[PDB]
């Protein structure tokens, strides 16, 4: 499957998650004290996370923002 990935405010680069996985999940953190970090990863499940962090996965082509 193909998904857009790019750890940045305004930016998205197409990627290919060719492997045992199928969907693409993304996780980033945003807090005070000038804090902002993003990280994506291929998988086949959409787990959860803390109420502070942000997580989002997609199971469609060009879906994963």
UniProtKB/Swiss-Prot annotation:
Intracellular or extracellular location(s): Secreted
Keywords: Acetylcholine receptor inhibiting toxin, Disulfide bond, Ion channel impairing toxin, Neurotoxin, Postsynaptic neurotoxin, Secreted, Signal, Toxin
Major place of residence: secreted
GO cellular component, one term: extracellular region
GO molecular-function terms, A-Z: acetylcholine receptor inhibitor activity; ion channel regulator activity; toxin activity
Expression sites by tissue: Expressed by the venom gland.
Disulfide bridges in this chain: 3-24, 6-11, 17-42, 46-57, 58-63
UniProt key word Translocase: no
Family listed: Belongs to the three-finger toxin family. Ancestral subfamily. Orphan group II sub-subfamily.
Function: Binds with low affinity to muscular (alpha-1-beta-1-delta-epsilon/CHRNA1-CHRNB1-CHRND-CHRNE) and very low affinity to neuronal (alpha-7/CHRNA7) nicotinic acetylcholine receptor (nAChR).
Protein name: Weak toxin 1
Source organism: Bungarus candidus (Malayan krait)
Residues of the full protein shown: 22 to 86 of 86
């Amino acid at each position: 499957l193909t998904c857009l990935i790019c750890p940045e405010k305004d930016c998205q680069k197409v990627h290919t998650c060719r492997n045992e996985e199928k969907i693409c999940v993304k996780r980033f953190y945003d807090k005070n004290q000038l804090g902002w970090r993003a990280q994506r990863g291929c998988a086949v499940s959409c787990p959860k996370a803390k109420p502070n962090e942000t997580v989002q996965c997609c199971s469609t082509d060009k879906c994963n923002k």
